[PDB]
Write a protein that binds this ligand. Structure first.
Ligand SMILES: CC(C)CCC[C@@H](C)[C@H]1CC[C@H]2[C@@H]3CC=C4C[C@@H](O)CC[C@]4(C)[C@H]3CC[C@]12C
Ligand SMILES: CC(C)CCC[C@@H](C)[C@H]1CC[C@H]2[C@@H]3CC=C4C[C@@H](O)CC[C@]4(C)[C@H]3CC[C@]12C
Ligand SMILES: C=CCc1ccccc1OC[C@@H](O)CNC(C)C
Length: 439
């Protein structure tokens, strides 16, 4: 039974190293992955690799041998390394939340305000301060318990049980974990509220129109380009190429950049908006609407034209009358539902509720944000039991046995392998992992 545990544990060490080197090397090799967010994730992956190389193996040995055998120096050092990693980890996540926050409330949404170089220094500082507040307490013996049972473990080279004074337990916890955890959760839940609230029509259309820079066909059959920008309803491909070159003013040959695409997209919307104001049957309803459903109304016009969207007189009767639930039924009773249901669903909900809840986590950088949300939430769930129970030991001396402290600590250890797996959400990281694993 001791043996099975040792396989389980060995598997873990390898999962942390395999996982984390795979994260670190990807970022090292591919210049596309070198961003401010991915610089911090490297420092996060380093702490997990140092955890997996230095902390975890020696813990497993300590458990199974039932005694420390590495000499009191590496006992003290093993601890400071271990404390250093948990402190550097949580404070990196905190910094990542703040970097996200200042990104999303800038005019450059989703892009960091830090430079690559200024970022590198933020990482060094985190480690410098973390190192000092992890090591000095430990090496200067300031952590040490005064009572006898502890003092017997100190002067023994084969006892490495972690014993600390009440005041250290509190002071180390608040600064090492509670402060950054709290700032992280506060800030990042606002980074989610910023994204949701800062959704405009441009992202909304991008989400359910897609983007292609080569010429393609819509489900109607006609030639389209960019973000759902029709070129012609003529079946001749050269006619499409001709209408594109006419639009941009360049010999594209079916190839355009995002620059040329988003300029078209902006012209397309403004005209779709102009068209709603010009049309007599639509304009009255548009003034009636809040900013959100205003965008829901342009979304249709973009797709079906000013004429067509002026066809749904009943839907427009009831939207003018604010009966969102009633208008959604009639919009369901339409060929538009039958032709494109996934878009219809999303657009109808927006009319229904009046919120972006049908479009959450749909945009790319909104998926990028959720992934970052998932690593943060997991680290919380992995350590919070351990850290709370650590504080409840200091308040109530007898509630917390050895077995529980070690087990809870070990859910925290298991956290060092999860991040690489969670990055497989990112199709940037997924493509990277396969290339490196030569699949
Ligand atoms: C084992 C313990 C005691 C020592 C490990 C700490 C040092 C060597 C490591 C841990 C994390 C590392 C950083 C991780 C992030 C990278 C970003 C990269 O673009 C430049 C180097 C930089 C900034 C690293 C510098 C060295 C670093 C701070
Ligand atoms: C006792 C043991 C665990 C100490 C060894 C710590 C190792 C894992 C640390 C020390 C220095 C670190 C490296 C410092 C330089 C950076 C360059 C960056 O672009 C990719 C990560 C990389 C390459 C770091 C990866 C992790 C690293 C190699
Ligand atoms: C109060 C100590 C708990 C603690 C505080 C700050 C940073 C890390 C902390 O705990 C990490 C654990 O992995 C320690 N494990 C011990 C050393 C066996």
């Amino acid at each position: 039974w001791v043996v099975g545990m040792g396989i389980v544990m060995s598997l873990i060490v390898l999962a942390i190293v395999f996982g984390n080197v795979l994260v670190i090397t990807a970022i090292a090799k591919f210049e596309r992955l070198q961003t401010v967010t991915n610089y911090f994730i490297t420092s996060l992956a380093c702490a997990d690799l140092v955890m997996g190389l230095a902390v975890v193996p020696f813990g497993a040995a300590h458990i199974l041998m039932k005694m420390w055998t590495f000499g009191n120096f590496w006992c003290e050092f093993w601890t400071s390394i271990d404390v250093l990693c948990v402190t550097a980890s949580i404070w990196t996540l905190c910094v990542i939340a703040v970097d996200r926050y200042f990104a999303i409330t800038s005019p450059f949404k989703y892009q960091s305000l830090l430079t690559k170089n200024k970022a590198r220094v933020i990482i060094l500082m985190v480690w410098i301060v973390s190192g000092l507040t992890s090591f000095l307490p430990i090496q200067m013996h300031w952590y040490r318990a005064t009572h006898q049972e502890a003092i017997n473990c100190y002067a023994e080279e084969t006892c490495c049980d972690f014993f600390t004074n009440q005041a250290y337990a509190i002071a180390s916890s608040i600064v090492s974990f509670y402060v950054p955890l709290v700032i992280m959760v506060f800030v990042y839940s606002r980074v989610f509220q910023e994204a949701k609230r800062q959704l405009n029509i441009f992202e909304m259309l991008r989400i359910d129109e897609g983007l292609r820079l080569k010429i393609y066909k819509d489900t109607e059959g006609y030639y389209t380009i960019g973000i759902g920008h029709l070129l012609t309803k003529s079946p001749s491909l050269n006619a499409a190429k001709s209408e594109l070159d006419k639009a941009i003013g360049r010999n594209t040959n079916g190839v355009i950049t995002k620059d040329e695409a988003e300029k078209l997209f902006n012209q397309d919307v403004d005209a779709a908006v102009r068209g709603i104001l010009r049309n007599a049957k639509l304009k009255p309803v548009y003034d009636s609407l809040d900013a959100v459903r205003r965008a829901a109304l342009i979304n249709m016009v973009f797709q079906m034209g000013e004429t067509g969207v002026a066809g749904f007189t009943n839907s427009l009767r009831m939207l003018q009358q604010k009966r969102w639930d009633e208008a959604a039924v009639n919009l369901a009773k339409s060929r538009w539902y039958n032709q494109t249901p996934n878009r219809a669903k999303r657009v109808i909900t927006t009319f229904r509720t009046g919120t972006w809840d049908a479009y959450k986590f749909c945009l790319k950088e909104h998926k990028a944000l959720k992934t970052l949300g998932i690593i943060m939430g997991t680290f919380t769930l992995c350590w919070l039991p351990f850290f709370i129970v650590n504080i409840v030991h200091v308040i109530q001396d007898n509630l917390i046995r050895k077995e529980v402290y070690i087990l809870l600590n070990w859910i925290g250890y298991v956290n060092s392998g999860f991040n690489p797996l969670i990055y497989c959400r990112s199709p940037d990281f997924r493509i990277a992992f396969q290339e490196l694993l030569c699949l």
